[PDB]
Amino acid sequence: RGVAGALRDLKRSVLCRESLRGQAAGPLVASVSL
Amino acid sequence: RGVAGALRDLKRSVLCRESLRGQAAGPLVASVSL
Amino acid sequence: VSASSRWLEGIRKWYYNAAGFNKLGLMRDDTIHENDDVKEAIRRLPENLYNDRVFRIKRALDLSMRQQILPKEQWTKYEEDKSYLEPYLKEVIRERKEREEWAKK
Amino acid sequence: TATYAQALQSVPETQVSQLDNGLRVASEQSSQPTCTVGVWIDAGSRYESEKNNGAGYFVEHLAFKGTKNRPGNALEKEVESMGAHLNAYSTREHTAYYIKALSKDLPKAVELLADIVQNCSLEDSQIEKERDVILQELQENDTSMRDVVFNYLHATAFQGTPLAQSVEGPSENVRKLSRADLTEYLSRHYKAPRMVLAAAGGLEHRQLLDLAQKHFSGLSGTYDEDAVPTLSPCRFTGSQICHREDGLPLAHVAIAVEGPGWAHPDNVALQVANAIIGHYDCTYGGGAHLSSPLASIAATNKLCQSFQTFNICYADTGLLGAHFVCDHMSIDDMMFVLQGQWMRLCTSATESEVLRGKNLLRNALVSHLDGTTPVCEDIGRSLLTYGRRIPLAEWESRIAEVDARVVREVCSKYFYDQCPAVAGFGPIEQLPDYNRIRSGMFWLRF
Amino acid sequence: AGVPPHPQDLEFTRLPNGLVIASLENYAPASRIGLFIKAGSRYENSNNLGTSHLLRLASSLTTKGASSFKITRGIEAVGGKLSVTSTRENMAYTVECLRDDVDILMEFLLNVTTAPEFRRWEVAALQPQLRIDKAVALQNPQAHVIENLHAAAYRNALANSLYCPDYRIGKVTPVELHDYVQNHFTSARMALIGLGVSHPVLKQVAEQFLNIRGGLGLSGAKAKYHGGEIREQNGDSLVHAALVAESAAIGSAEANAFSVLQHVLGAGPHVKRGSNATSSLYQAVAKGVHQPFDVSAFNASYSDSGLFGFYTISQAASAGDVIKAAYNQVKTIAQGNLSNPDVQAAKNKLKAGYLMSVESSEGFLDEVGSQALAAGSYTPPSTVLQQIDAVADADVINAAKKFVSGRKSMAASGNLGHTPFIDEL
Amino acid sequence: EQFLNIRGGLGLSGAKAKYHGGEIREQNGDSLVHAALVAESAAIGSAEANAFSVL
Numbered sequence A, B: 001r002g003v004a005g006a007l008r009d010l011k012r013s014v015l016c017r018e019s020l021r022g023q024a025a026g027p028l029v030a031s032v033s034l
Numbered sequence C: 001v002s003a004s005s006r007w008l009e010g011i012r013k014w015y016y017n018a019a020g021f022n023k024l025g026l027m028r029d030d031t032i033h034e035n036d037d038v039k040e041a042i043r044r045l046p047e048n049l050y051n052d053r054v055f056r057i058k059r060a061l062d063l064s065m066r067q068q069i070l071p072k073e074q075w076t077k078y079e080e081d082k083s084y085l086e087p088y089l090k091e092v093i094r095e096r097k098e099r100e101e102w103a104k105k
Numbered sequence D: 001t002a003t004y005a006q007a008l009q010s011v012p013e014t015q016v017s018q019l020d021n022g023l024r025v026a027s028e029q030s031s032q033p034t035c036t037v038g039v040w041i042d043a044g045s046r047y048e049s050e051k052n053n054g055a056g057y058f059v060e061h062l063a064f065k066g067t068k069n070r071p072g073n074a075l076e077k078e079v080e081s082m083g084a085h086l087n088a089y090s091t092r093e094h095t096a097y098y099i100k101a102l103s104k105d106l107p108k109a110v111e112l113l114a115d116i117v118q119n120c121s122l123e124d125s126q127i128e129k130e131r132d133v134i135l136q137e138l139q140e141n142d143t144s145m146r147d148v149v150f151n152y153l154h155a156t157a158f159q160g161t162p163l164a165q166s167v168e169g170p171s172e173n174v175r176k177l178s179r180a181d182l183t184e185y186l187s188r189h190y191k192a193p194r195m196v197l198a199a200a201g202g203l204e205h206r207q208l209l210d211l212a213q214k215h216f217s218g219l220s221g222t223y224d225e226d227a228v229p230t231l232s233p234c235r236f237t238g239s240q241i242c243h244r245e246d247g248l249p250l251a252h253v254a255i256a257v258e259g260p261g262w263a264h265p266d267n268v269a270l271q272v273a274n275a276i277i278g279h280y281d282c283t284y285g286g287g288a289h290l291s292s293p294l295a296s297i298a299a300t301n302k303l304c305q306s307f308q309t310f311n312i313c314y315a316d317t318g319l320l321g322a323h324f325v326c327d328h329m330s331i332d333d334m335m336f337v338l339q340g341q342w343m344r345l346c347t348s349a350t351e352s353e354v355l356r357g358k359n360l361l362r363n364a365l366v367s368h369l370d371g372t373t374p375v376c377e378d379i380g381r382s383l384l385t386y387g388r389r390i391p392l393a394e395w396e397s398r399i400a401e402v403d404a405r406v407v408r409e410v411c412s413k414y415f416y417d418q419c420p421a422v423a424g425f426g427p428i429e430q431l432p433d434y435n436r437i438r439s440g441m442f443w444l445r446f
Numbered sequence E: 001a002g003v004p005p006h007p008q009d010l011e012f013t014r015l016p017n018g019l020v021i022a023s024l025e026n027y028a029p030a031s032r033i034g035l036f037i038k039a040g041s042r043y044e045n046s047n048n049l050g051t052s053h054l055l056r057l058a059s060s061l062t063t064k065g066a067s068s069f070k071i072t073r074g075i076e077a078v079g080g081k082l083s084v085t086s087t088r089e090n091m092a093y094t095v096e097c098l099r100d101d102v103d104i105l106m107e108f109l110l111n112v113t114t115a116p117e118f119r120r121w122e123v124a125a126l127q128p129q130l131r132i133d134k135a136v137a138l139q140n141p142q143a144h145v146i147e148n149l150h151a152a153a154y155r156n157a158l159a160n161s162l163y164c165p166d167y168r169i170g171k172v173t174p175v176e177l178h179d180y181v182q183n184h185f186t187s188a189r190m191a192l193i194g195l196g197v198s199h200p201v202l203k204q205v206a207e208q209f210l211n212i213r214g215g216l217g218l219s220g221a222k223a224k225y226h227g228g229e230i231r232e233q234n235g236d237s238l239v240h241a242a243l244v245a246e247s248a249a250i251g252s253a254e255a256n257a258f259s260v261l262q263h264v265l266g267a268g269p270h271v272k273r274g275s276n277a278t279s280s281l282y283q284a285v286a287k288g289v290h291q292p293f294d295v296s297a298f299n300a301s302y303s304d305s306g307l308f309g310f311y312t313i314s315q316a317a318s319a320g321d322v323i324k325a326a327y328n329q330v331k332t333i334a335q336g337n338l339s340n341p342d343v344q345a346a347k348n349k350l351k352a353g354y355l356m357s358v359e360s361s362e363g364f365l366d367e368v369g370s371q372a373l374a375a376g377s378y379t380p381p382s383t384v385l386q387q388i389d390a391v392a393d394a395d396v397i398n399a400a401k402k403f404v405s406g407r408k409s410m411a412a413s414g415n416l417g418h419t420p421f422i423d424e425l
Numbered sequence F: 001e002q003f004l005n006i007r008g009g010l011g012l013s014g015a016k017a018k019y020h021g022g023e024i025r026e027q028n029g030d031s032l033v034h035a036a037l038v039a040e041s042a043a044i045g046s047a048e049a050n051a052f053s054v055l
């Protein structure tokens, strides 16, 4: 499954402050598979 | 017919230096009709 | 205004209860025969009335399949029957008549 | 206040004079501080042979590049420094060079037009420069599907005749046209009786005639040693040309029948009919509610990106029809509706829609002759074609005659059961076969 | 004799409510009317971008006195026209017809501008037209350059695009169109212009149907120049690029110096297929560039700001060389190397060009309509030429000095491998 | 040694990344504003980069 990481179909919404922690980026990576 | 002026379907290509004069812009205007 | 136009309503309330679409939880405008004018009026309904109209009709086709009706508590009261479609429908017709008057100039 | 009929009398009549050598001088005075003056010429590709085709277009490239009294770029400098503008064009029948400038600059402007026509340098080094220029312009034109498909319409419709030729000529002629070919073209065609010095703006006709007698007296006299270009009639051929190219995103179609010509009263009634069908493209606002059924249907069902009717006039002939641009799966539907409207106007045109087409033509005529340049163009062209200026008061009279009976008679004369010329370009697999097109030019119910 | 009659004079009036009326009776066969409104895209904010574009497409929608069907058919029956042109500052509702049918088109014009209904479904059917209309415009690489140029130059207001941002198509609401016309189509913001119409009629119309109060007073939402650059890497064959700096607001005398400076450098070609011998920028670039290109001075002047500079088209590899050659040519003028015959020639072109731009009814009506909104007055051409003649050569030089030293804005699109950034100039 | 001995191509090019600074602003219809603000720091491996990691 394709990946994009960076922290070190309608998807889903974020509203509160507890589910929002962990979202701010921290360098991008792009990965591909079979 | 809709208009866009600014000088004061595959469209067409420009190659020579004589047909290229008159193209550089000189403030945009957007017009609409029936 | 008077007592004569009040039993007029009484016989229209009578015909309403006899027609019996209120027994399926339906409103008068839910039963209009869809022609081109009506299909346009339905197209123009806001999302809330369209979705409500869809469910009431779906609820009634469900009941009709079982040959059942709703409890009397849940019947559409003649007093509370919102003619929600005729404003839209009357404007559709008004537009069509305008085209027709231009078409003979 | 003034009425529309009263306003048409208030236009000044074009004053007309003729010099002693043949040149014709015509002006419409106004109260403008600006003006345009130019020379219109009876010249173009229709006068050219296959062996020197494209010559007059070669001349257009060279006219502004130098002259004997003002060699090189000296001519550019003089018009640019007085804030003037200088332009030219060439059709299949007419050639024009005109200047836009201040009214006070009219005497210098006339002098420059005279120096351009008569005294042209044509240095052999400038020619070799303009040769590579034209070839590039040809590569540019190949990408304008519109300009291609109309050159194709002329090529098939007038096959075997001078009108089949393009204005620019073929690439092979550009590469071998010599200086001798060009001077022969000029000496033959650029003669005083076949030219008009037209002007429009704030200027008295006395002044324009004085300058003509001064700067255009050196032209060739009335006689030309017995070698006059006499335009022969041009055979129209019902035919079809398809350039299949599925790599292009949209197909271009042009279809037309033969029209009468310039000085035929039928053109008025034909233009009324073309206005009913009208024109369209995807940026118009009306869409579904447009009057024209072709337009209304095309917007509702999205049958085309654009279409336009036309009545192209030439001497004693012309091309009358339409042209459109659409997706590859919409060509048949567009042609069905198009022909259906031609047939419907031939057989059952109504009075109301003809009043609309009349008013559309009225509006189109007044608003086109708005400004010094389009009046000066109408002056120059109208004297080469009609031999006179037709006042707006006359055009209005020739229109008001038109009623529904007139368009039915006029349209049937040119459209009903006539062989059309067709030209296609692009993804035109769905372009109907010519026999099917030909059967769309009549109705079995009629 | 064949002469024209006594040319009537333009009449002009300012009503106390702020509305402006200007009429001219040229006794022409056709009549033209325009309602010019200070409602261009600068008056959008970041919560309703694109509203003035969709509004510009909705003139034929249904009003209170005319169905959508009647507007289209009524105007076409007479053969008349209805158009809507938009600047970053103004919207201009124009109407054209024969002078006997002015009654009809005036009624339509007032319904469009005073009584739009913006019905939910009509608006909904119209949103796809934004995508088509924008797509057509951006077929010109110039269009996206200028749009990006203003977005890079300004923080707000004039940064806004004439064309709806992609993310807003389908999301412009009927409420936003209603609020936009309420806030911006006010008497204080309007001008009613007419050719082939008498002044008493326009004044009567204005007093009866164009007395709208409230909304927003002429807001002081001043455009804040910023500078910056936007770079669009694409697959065009040529690089288009524009480089500007803040210049002068329209009407002021400094703006006339910038207009003259434009025609010193080179605004456009005057002769077909010419080398542009008297174009300073073209000859400067052509010396060190023997490949196809174009270059022109760019001048844009607004109510409270302006942009001046040049615009270049060149092969992707010749990008910087064309830019730098153009820039150095302006530097020469800022250093005071400017002859007086070159200024008199530029004042000739500008004077000649201005008069030419007002020959026709459409160009005349546009100038009068935009004069009325920008200046609240009408300035005849003889006075314009006087203001041009009043430009001194030092004013032109100082204008070129303001460009060289001012914070710059750049927009470029193409293969930008050889297209310099600002700090590389 | 047998399958990954490929020569030529481009030596480890000194196409050095040139820091510049600037800003890019994407107006869209997201409900929240995401934003990042940075400055040039330190190349990996150097001791200054460890200070940035700790920071």
Ligand SMILES: CCCCCC(=O)OC[C@H](COP(=O)([O-])OCCN)OC(=O)CCCCC
Binding pocket: D439, D440, D441, D442, D443, D444
């Ligand atoms: C009793 C009369 C029946 C008429 C049938 C008819 O005319 O069909 C259409 C064609 C000719 O018309 P068109 O194809 O030119 O289209 C004209 C478009 N305007 O004719 C034929 O070739 C069909 C052969 C039928 C055999 C059974």
